RNA sequence: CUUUAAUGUUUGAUGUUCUAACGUUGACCCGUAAUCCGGGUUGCGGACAGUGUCUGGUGGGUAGUUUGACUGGGGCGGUCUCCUCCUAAAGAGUAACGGAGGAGCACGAAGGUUGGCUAAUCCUGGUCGGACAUCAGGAGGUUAGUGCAAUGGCAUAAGCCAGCUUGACUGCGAGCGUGACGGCGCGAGCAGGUGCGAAAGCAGGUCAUAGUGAUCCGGUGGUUCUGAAUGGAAGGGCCAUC
RNA sequence: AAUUCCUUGUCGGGUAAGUUCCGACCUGCACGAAUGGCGUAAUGAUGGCCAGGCUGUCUCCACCCGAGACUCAGUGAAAUUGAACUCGCUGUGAAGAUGCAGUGUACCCGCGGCAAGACGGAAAGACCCCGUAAACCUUUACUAUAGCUUGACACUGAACA
RNA sequence: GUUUAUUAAAAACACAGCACUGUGCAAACACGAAAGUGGACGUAUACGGUGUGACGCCUGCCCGGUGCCGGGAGGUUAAU
RNA sequence: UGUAACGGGGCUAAACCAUGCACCGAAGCUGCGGCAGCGACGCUUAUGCGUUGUUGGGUAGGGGAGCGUUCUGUAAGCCUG
RNA sequence: AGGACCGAACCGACUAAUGUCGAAAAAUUAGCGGAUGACUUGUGGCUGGGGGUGAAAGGCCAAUCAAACCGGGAGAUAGCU
RNA sequence: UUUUGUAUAAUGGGUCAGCGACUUAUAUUCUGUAGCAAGGUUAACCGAAUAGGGGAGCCGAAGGGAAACCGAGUCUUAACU
RNA sequence: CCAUAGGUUAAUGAGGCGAACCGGGGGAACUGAAACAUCUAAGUACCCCGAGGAAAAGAAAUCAACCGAGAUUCCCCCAG
């Protein structure tokens, strides 16, 4: 409900995305996770989008 | 008048599926249980639901070890 | 979505019908043999609030409002508007 | 008159080479982000219609 | 922004004048022996009214319809999916408007790993300081804790703390568990790529069990897989998702 | 109270005795002023109550007169009906027995009467529930629509401000 | 006076009166896709609707709600 | 409504308990005769048997095997004043 | 003079009994109300099915009325007997 | 007949005779059966016509995949133990 | 005023009936959707007009696939 859902978009050339949740009104700094990109087959940084 | 109860749940079907000396093919669930009532022993894995799954097509055998006497589940290899 | 039925709400449950928010002040829920149920609801207008009297049936009634009445601190005036601050979370309000 | 096919079942099943039927699993159209990717791997390929509800599929599509 | 004036301003907003559309249920004349109709003049209205199409409003005037089920008759009241315990008769399962409680989440750390640590409550002594804060010692033993109800579990801790961290990873998955079915659960291992650790190893979320909804229709991103003569595209499909 | 629940309110009148009637009080569950309030002569096959006269209404029925009923001659229906050689009782039993069990009683068959029973006859219960039944009716139910109403284009033009 | 022909004749309906309201006449309104008719060969002392119901004394306060009437600054809003 | 709380008569055992043998009692069981299904078999056969083993209550319901009726061919045949 | 009065015809339908496989699918008998009027009656017109008409009862519209009758869609549909 | 259960005082039938309720069409699947057999069979139509022509077609011998595409393999996947 | 409008007279034609088929104008609802409103039933029933022995359609501003086919109607496939 409160904890809305965001979209971690890959910082590689492709548009693979992970989707997840984040409570924005308590910790509003963006997520800078480092996840596996199955298009590049590498482990590049992901970044929050809507 | 009225009532406030009448609510329960889908019975989870727990307990032991494969008993004592009864050959189990690897990966076969043996005990489906809430916590670690039965602990994993030789050749038997423990899942994320404390379901002790077999790991080697063999027998079963329960025991009691250490200084806590916890039924333990091993796997004789046949 | 927060839909309400008229046999449910007690008092203070803020409802939203006909483009305006309403506070319920009180409601008397009656139903008589060989009739259906109705709740003679003593509402309160919220934007232009004098009073309003609606006698709802048992069905239906209205959606609720985002209607938070929290403590704000008056601290500022400029032209027209009047700014406020929460002493719990420090969010702006105009 | 010849039997008319239920057209909605025609778009959801397909005959395999020994009489069975294949169907797409039914949980993978929306609220997916609360599902684990273990469920969103096993629901992705095609399934086979079970022995119980196989007679209801044969009756509602006779030509396929 | 807020005023002022010039121009091409897009123009609408109304407001007199006119007669030729139009109206006349005003007079006269003729069809005509006819308080109908038509024509002929004249007067008064007059681009209004009225009508057609499109359109917003109002519209029980009128029409088609809906108005749930369980229920110790029905109405009323309560309840409807999920999780925990009992009833449940020591495998599983098991009903009642049987007896009790909870959920419609939270968390980027409260997840992963490595390294350490051990509670509750009384007791005495001690500045402010008390029944109770912090300090010290003892008794005590997990009566504590476990993000949240209950049960099972927990010292190798799953409980407490600190560092590094993103395995809360993609493709699969032998084998079972459990449902009439849709489905749901567990899962060693395999490939790719990472994290932590000297390493052995662990890690595809959290102590487990609630925290949730099928299809259809549609939205966004990706992928030339199709693309109604052909070339594109549109629209479909697949994949990720809402 | 055409309105009052409690309630036959309490008080007074009437009666030997009055839950009704009449007067009054006011604690009006829940009167009330044109969905009219309160009076009101007259009128009413109007509602309640009391009195005189009157009586078989009644105590409590008696008798008489006619028409049926009854017998006889003639004509000649009907509802009804599984079949019946169609008793009482106590029990049992789909839980109220002519039919079962135990038992008692009863010669065969009419006729006039009376209706306690045959869950007697008539009417596929109207009450109650049920059907994803039907009809009408209501409205701030849902979706439409006639009618009313607004503006644009058309019929529809000419002059200036 | 009228009423449920065939279980209800009443306290119901009607009524003269009263008041509100619509209607300026090609009237409101009704019937009708429309023509046309009724209203009415009438014209506000007239007609339609609605409530009340002879007469006597009367008819109190409330415009928040809903309808109605009036107003147009502003906001919202259709076709085009 | 009528005894009406052994079924009734009636019983002081014809009641109760113990122990003992007799007998009654079912469509059970056995005997004797027939019938049908199914499974085995031997040796036969177009399948039967001294055989043998067993089986045969039945609603909803499934399976099997038939009878009879009218009409068409066999049939201008056959039966029949 | 009068929706004045008493009361026959005419019109009605208040009470009671009888009748309720009736004499009659609503009548008879004994009483009862209006009876110069918002009266009654004869003849002939007119208004129609979601329509008429209605001093209003949802009454009446051919012994039918909360939507007539007839024919058709039509063997509507019936998870019920 | 309906039922948990009917002598039931639950339904139904006065009786008799006649009539009165699982059909027909076209598709589809399994069972039997007959034909031919990696083949089988035609539909309209033509026809001196329940013959013979007519192979238009239909099902089957090949699957996998959403599809392109590939083929005794194919899909999944960057690749399959 | 010419002329038209109207009147007259003649000539010729139609009018009405009819079972089905046939083209047009208007057009349901029950039902099915296990309720219902989109939808179905169904352009069905039904109503009205119009002709013929048949009627309507009919000589590509038709399809096709880059090769081609040659008006319309009807039957069998494609094809549930
Ligand atoms: O019930 C009711 C009516 C009165 C007697 C029985 N039937």
UniProtKB/Swiss-Prot annotation, chain A:
Q: Biological process GO annotation list? A: cytoplasmic translation; response to antibiotic; ribosomal large subunit assembly
One Gene Ontology MF term: tRNA binding
Q: State one Pfam family annotation.
A: Ribosomal_L33
Show the GO cellular component annotation of the record.
Answer: cytoplasm; cytosol; cytosolic large ribosomal subunit
> Ribonucleoprotein among the record's keywords?
yes
Which Cys pairs are S-S linked? Answer: none
Which domain of life, per UniProt?
A: Bacteria
Going by the UniProt record, its keywords in alphabetical order are: Methylation, Ribonucleoprotein, Ribosomal protein, RNA-binding, tRNA-binding
Similarity remark: Belongs to the bacterial ribosomal protein bL33 family.
Further remark: Surface exposed on the 50S subunit.
**Quaternary context:** Part of the 50S ribosomal subunit. Cross-links to the P and E site tRNAs.
Write down what this protein is called: Large ribosomal subunit protein bL33
**Organism per entry:** Escherichia coli (strain K12)
Curated annotation (Swiss-Prot), chain B:
Gene3D superfamilies the record matches: 2.40.50.100
Annotated GO molecular function terms are: ribosome binding; rRNA binding; structural constituent of ribosome; tRNA binding
Q: Which UniProt keywords apply?
A: Ribonucleoprotein, Ribosomal protein, RNA-binding, rRNA-binding, tRNA-binding
GO CC annotation terms, alphabetical: cytoplasm; cytosolic large ribosomal subunit
Q: Does the keyword Protease apply?
A: no
State the InterPro entries in the record: Ribosomal_bL27, Ribosomal_bL27_CS
Stretches the record annotates as Disordered:
1-13
Record-linked SUPFAM superfamilies: Ribosomal L27 protein-like
Pfam families in the cross-refs: Ribosomal_L27
Q: Which GO terms describe its biological process?
A: assembly of large subunit precursor of preribosome; cytoplasmic translation; cytosolic ribosome assembly; positive regulation of ribosome biogenesis; regulation of cell growth; ribosomal large subunit assembly
The family assignment reads: Belongs to the bacterial ribosomal protein bL27 family.
NCBIfam families associated with the record: L27
Q: Which HAMAP family match?
A: Ribosomal_bL27
Describe the protein's quaternary organization and the partners it interacts with: Part of the 50S ribosomal subunit. Cross-links to the 23S rRNA. Cross-links to the A and P site tRNAs.
Q: What's this protein's name? A: Large ribosomal subunit protein bL27
* Origin species: Escherichia coli (strain K12)
Curated annotation (Swiss-Prot), chain C:
- Localisation per UniProt entry: Cytoplasm
Q: Which GO terms describe its biological process?
A: negative regulation of translational frameshifting; peptide biosynthetic process; rescue of stalled ribosome; translational elongation
Keywords in alphabetical order, please: Cytoplasm, Elongation factor, Hydroxylation, Protein biosynthesis
Pathway(s) where this gene product acts: Protein biosynthesis; polypeptide chain elongation
Q: What's this chain's function?
A: Involved in peptide bond synthesis. Alleviates ribosome stalling that occurs when 3 or more consecutive Pro residues or the sequence PPG is present in a protein, possibly by augmenting the peptidyl transferase activity of the ribosome. Beta-lysylation at Lys-34 is required for alleviation. The Pro codons and their context do not affect activity; only consecutive Pro residues (not another amino acid) are affected by EF-P.
How does the record describe its quaternary structure?
Answer: Binds 30S, 50S and 70S ribosomes, possibly near the A site, note that T.thermophilus structures show binding between the P and E sites (PDB 3HUW and 3HUY). Proportionally less EF-P binds to larger polysomes, suggesting it has a role early in translation. It is present in 1 copy per 10 ribosomes.
* Protein name (database record): Elongation factor P
Swiss-Prot record, chain D:
One of the Pfam families matching this protein, by short name: Ribosomal_L35p
The family database entries (InterPro entries) matched by this protein are listed as: Ribosomal_bL35, Ribosomal_bL35-like, Ribosomal_bL35_CS, Ribosomal_bL35_sf
> What one GO molecular function would you report for this record?
structural constituent of ribosome
Q: Where is this region: Disordered?
A: 1-21
* Keywords, in A-Z order: Ribonucleoprotein, Ribosomal protein
PROSITE patterns for the chain: RIBOSOMAL_L35 (PS00936)
Q: Where is the composition biased (Basic residues)?
A: 9-21
- GO CC terms for this protein? cytoplasm; cytosolic large ribosomal subunit
Which GO biological process annotations does it have?
cytoplasmic translation
Q: Which family does it belong to?
A: Belongs to the bacterial ribosomal protein bL35 family.
**Quaternary form?**
Part of the 50S ribosomal subunit.
Q: Which NCBIfam families match?
A: rpmI_bact
User: Protein name, please?
Assistant: Large ribosomal subunit protein bL35
* Gene that encodes the chain: rpmI
């Amino acid at each position: 409900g409160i904890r809305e859902k965001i979209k971690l978009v890959s910082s590689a050339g492709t548009g693979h995305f992970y989707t997840t949740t984040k409570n924005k009104r308590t910790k509003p700094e963006k997520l800078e996770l480092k996840k596996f990109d199955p298009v590049v087959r590498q482990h590049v940084i992901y970044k929050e989008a809507k | 008048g009225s009532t406030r109860n009448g609510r329960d749940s889908e019975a989870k079907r727990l307990g032991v599926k494969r008993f004592g000396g009864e050959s189990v093919l690897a990966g076969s669930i043996i005990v489906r249980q809430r916590g670690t009532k039965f602990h994993a022993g030789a050749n038997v894995g423990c899942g994320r639901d404390h379901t002790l799954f077999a790991k080697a097509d063999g027998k079963v055998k329960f025991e009691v070890k250490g200084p806590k006497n916890r039924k333990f589940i091993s796997i004789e290899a046949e | 979505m927060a839909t309400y039925y008229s046999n449910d709400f007690r008092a203070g449950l803020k409802i939203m019908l006909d483009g305006e928010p309403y506070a319920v002040e009180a409601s008397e829920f009656v139903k008589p043999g060989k009739g259906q149920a109705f709740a003679r609801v003593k509402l309160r207008r919220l934007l232009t609030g004098t009073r309003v009297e609606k006698t709802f049936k048992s069905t239906d009634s209205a959606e609720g409002a985002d209607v938070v009445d929290m403590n704000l601190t008056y601290l500022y005036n400029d032209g027209e508007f009047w700014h406020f601050m929460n002493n719990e979370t420090f969010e702006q309000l105009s | 008159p010849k039997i008319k096919t239920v057209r909605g079942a025609a778009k959801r099943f397909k005959k395999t080479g020994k009489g069975g039927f294949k169907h797409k699993h039914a949980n993978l159209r929306h609220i997916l982000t609360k599902k684990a990717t273990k469920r969103k791997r096993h629901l992705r390929p095609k399934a086979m219609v079970s022995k119980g509800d196989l007679g209801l599929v044969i009756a509602c599509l006779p030509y396929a």
